[PDB]
Symmetry: D2
Subunit: 335 residues, 4 copies
């Protein structure tokens, strides 16, 4: 139904495509991809992937500016400068902005110059741009919004249960580490990088970095402004990340009661978004799970009586892309 | 000077040997090794190691029950049952117990049956056994002690700065995660293990596990009984681990003041035991450092005003072995 | 139809179970598992696996000596000594011997003492034991055979195309390296192992080892006795291995003609066993492929005019288990 | 003595610096580095490295355009376009060209425009450019040569023993695989790359690639023109690579006799360049070895009677840089 274009056909982009493609009765129709990489490359990389594994579809080139996915021809255009793209002419309604570069209203604003009606950025914006997280504040999406964000996938992991915690015990202050699967921009071998931590061999190192995720939460849960801070440690697992959140709450509680509250929500207001796992699983068991955030219930601790600790696993790539589609077809669904 | 025997010549054992061997004017003399592995294997494995790298010494077999290390002949005996070992006859004074199995007074007690004068266990004991951590409570070692422990190397990392924090701001309650290099007992591929978490491929997984380290701290810093809890996440780095400690203190403080307190101690009561790093380093930069614990100062945070967070790197193998020698030559030094 | 028992429920065993379970109209019925590990563990490990990924089935305990797989109850018994097992009473026809230990006629012979009618060993035997490879010599299986082998999965990879090469160009002599995914018996950290190469950290090392595979080929392709030798290099990829075979042939040929011969067979006598890949794929694209051996056609070289080189990818775990079922239901099919 | 400038201060460049710096009585003096990265970064990255480990030196910034290495101030300049660099004014004699980009006489020729007297490229050139390998053809270096190459470090590994083999048994034809530590230009995660093989996650994959090394050998051992071909398989080890060379020789030989010939040369014409290892070592034991190439003698095979197979380990980074200095101080030594 909704005329959809994907800007950028790297990990996030391709990820969105196969996510959308696996859906029951998608309100969305994807007609075009803007990628400078070329049609041969876009095809190949869409079909094969070390993390998501081979795509279960007939993916091939259809001429020299399109790919088919089981017959379904998708168009492929190739401009570096977004103001050019034949959006207008192709009557595009929603752009998935996955390049990572055009995060402001001034960079992303270039898409509505090509004559596109709405833009969804797959990354936090630099102010004045409304971020949204399905399960957290999705209710607040006006149709008037021309440019919207979906935040980091860490924030997509963290916000849902922070909501639950805040709603039910009342976060006073808290801090958080994100044990995080290594990520594209890091260095295979020690080499040049603006972050001297991130210049360093990704496969050999626990590498510390800043995370936007803590302050970023405040954007979608205003009640938490300046109550959280964080750090990330990139580790040599390719995918699947864990958040390690310590908060102090106002309602005296205990480990078991916390876990009950998450289950309460996992079966109700967050069904499909939050899960609670009561099994002794390891990181690679959360590969390809459809939820933003799974609480590892055996690991929840409360010291005592008000400092609560919570460990949640998230699939950094797939779980996030799932949300992007969840957001995109709310945009579509209420037109 | 001190007649020293090493029981068990696996990682911990060999590690102790090359640690001792690199020392200025060692009060210790190592004369015997009890290993069922054999002399060819003990030699080879002592010379070559993926983590510590090739040992800078002439290591070779000397006949069939001894190895030389640059001429210095060390004897090698081979009984499974410790009550047998010719300790008495060889006049052994101090046994480094590195097998991991004989942790109680009833298992380790078997060494003084062979006629050994004192035993040092390289692991926490099961009650009635005094643990000791150099920098923390080493002052309390009586000579009367026949069986002593050195705790986990995690506790050896954590106790020193927990001391500082407790002494200076006063820990009320706190919790802690140990991002930890994977460890020998874990599974290369998914296979049988008492811990279903630990049955799982070590090189592919963030694997959660219990850590003794938090309660274990209380043993050496009694003021902290039941104030700390913890968890570990084994990750696919071979060596070099980080502790991620969140506490609530009673003296309102700020990130910068905390770091000053560690530096205060790193230059004084903990010189050589605690360091503070002001450089943006990554895990593999702490390989082969001589200290129990290095604070990553850029990472210290305080929210607000009393919840303090501290990240410290430790070399799990080398730093710990360094302490074992530090303990062993206190035992020797005051005879 | 065929009454089937699985001895040993580690990687190979569990692998066979989920392989069998995914089949169109299996002639096989699996009724019992002999595993000392326990029912809780066998369930969990059957459901979750880092290499094959979560099993797409309802796997759970059914009482204390059985597991269900989507309702289908499988029995679980637990003796260490095979002569005991209630095979006779349970009327077992075919034992999948996956423990790895009972490879001779004298060790495996213990199963027919429990009153089992035929045994299939999932590893090369020590002489007098007929090995079989589907696609290579499966035609020669008499029903009289009480004990049969399926060789190494390396031999299962190598034999098929060695056949083709031998049949069509005529191998004179040749040599071969198996770049091989690391394997269970290797060491996570440097520690005790009969092979001093294999004592060493698996995740950090290219580790050289002996392979049975070259001489083992001669067993199923007698024409090649003493014409091949090999070595393996274990590498830090978990699964998916490559064979790097150099032969000298008698029929002067060229890279392109060789590849044509494999395709000839991949579409005919080896359809489902050998594939030829004309795509620039990497190791992790061959995960979960159903064939013994995929030729990487872009990589075939001929120097000149008679020294041919061939690179084939194989899934060490899954592809092999697929064959085990292929063998097991030939045994069943011709009763 | 020799006025030396280093162009490019990435892995190869920094590697050369610490290599030169560790030398007995270097005829070389390094006075300048051209790096766009900046002085803070160049310092840090020179001091810390995941592969070579912390540099054993006082490395720090000295003002804003220089670094000190134990007092010894080295200058740091920063132009992208080489024709600009103040070589002339600084009286530079020899440029180490380590950027990788300026490999032709037309790109590298730009350095002698800045007024530099000789250039040494750390990579194969595109024709008309003399390559040199110490131990192989170093005798042929005229002083007239303004632009020289040092080939790939694979060729630096392979050429020495190919020489020995050719000299002593006489290579007729042969083929070769290079199991190779992953390398900078590969992809941390599946992403855009001219080579679709090399676009793929480096840490998860055995990735096949073309190697220049086989044809490249012919350049330094002309007798072997069109007698060798090769392929590489990048694997997830960071450093330390192995060459797997199969040749057919004319002198009927046997495994043991081959190995004797290498030892013959390792103690004579190739002392310090080729070694022969008779120990069951693994890849990570060859870290930081000073030789181009170590033969793994236990692995040599001869089938039969004339197809010889040889496995040699090389340190891709350090061993090569060692040669670069070996070449540079021949240039210096005969002025």
């Amino acid at each position: 139904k909704l005329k959809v274009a994907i800007n950028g056909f790297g990990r996030i982009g391709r990820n969105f495509l196969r996510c959308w493609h696996g859906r029951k009765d998608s309100p969305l129709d994807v007609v075009v991809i803007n990628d400078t990489g070329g049609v041969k490359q876009a095809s190949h990389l869409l079909k094969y992937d070390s993390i998501l594994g081979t795509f279960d579809a007939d993916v091939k080139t259809a001429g020299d500016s399109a790919i088919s996915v089981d017959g379904k021809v998708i168009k492929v255009v190739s401009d570096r400068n977004p103001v050019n793209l034949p959006w207008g002419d192709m009557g595009i309604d929603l752009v998935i902005e996955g390049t990572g570069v055009f995060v402001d209203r001034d960079g992303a604003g270039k898409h509505l110059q090509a004559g596109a009606k709405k833009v969804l950025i797959t990354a936090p914006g630099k102010g004045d741009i409304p971020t949204y997280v399905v399960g957290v504040n999705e209710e607040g999406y006006t149709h008037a919004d021309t440019i919207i964000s979906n935040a980091s996938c860490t924030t997509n992991c963290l916000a849902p249960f922070v909501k639950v915690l805040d709603q039910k015990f009342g976060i006073i202050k808290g801090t958080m580490t994100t044990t995080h699967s290594y990520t594209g921009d890091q260095r295979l071998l020690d080499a040049s990088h603006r972050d001297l931590r991130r210049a360093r061999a990704a496969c050999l190192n626990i590498v510390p970095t800043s995370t936007g995720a803590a302050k970023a939460v405040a954007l979608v849960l205003p009640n938490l402004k300046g109550k959280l801070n964080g750090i990330a440690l990139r580790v040599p697992t390719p995918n699947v990340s864990v958040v390690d959140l310590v908060v102090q709450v106002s309602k005296k509680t205990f480990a078991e009661e916390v876990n009950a509250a998450f289950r309460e929500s996992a079966d109700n207001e967050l069904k499909g978004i939050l899960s609670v796992c009561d099994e002794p699983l390891v990181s690679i068991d959360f590969r390809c799970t459809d939820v933003s955030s799974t609480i590892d219930s055996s690991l929840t601790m409360v010291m005592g009586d008000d400092m609560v600790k919570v460990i949640a696993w998230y699939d950094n790539e797939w779980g996030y892309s799932q949300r992007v589609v969840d957001l995109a077809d709310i945009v579509a669904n209420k037109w």
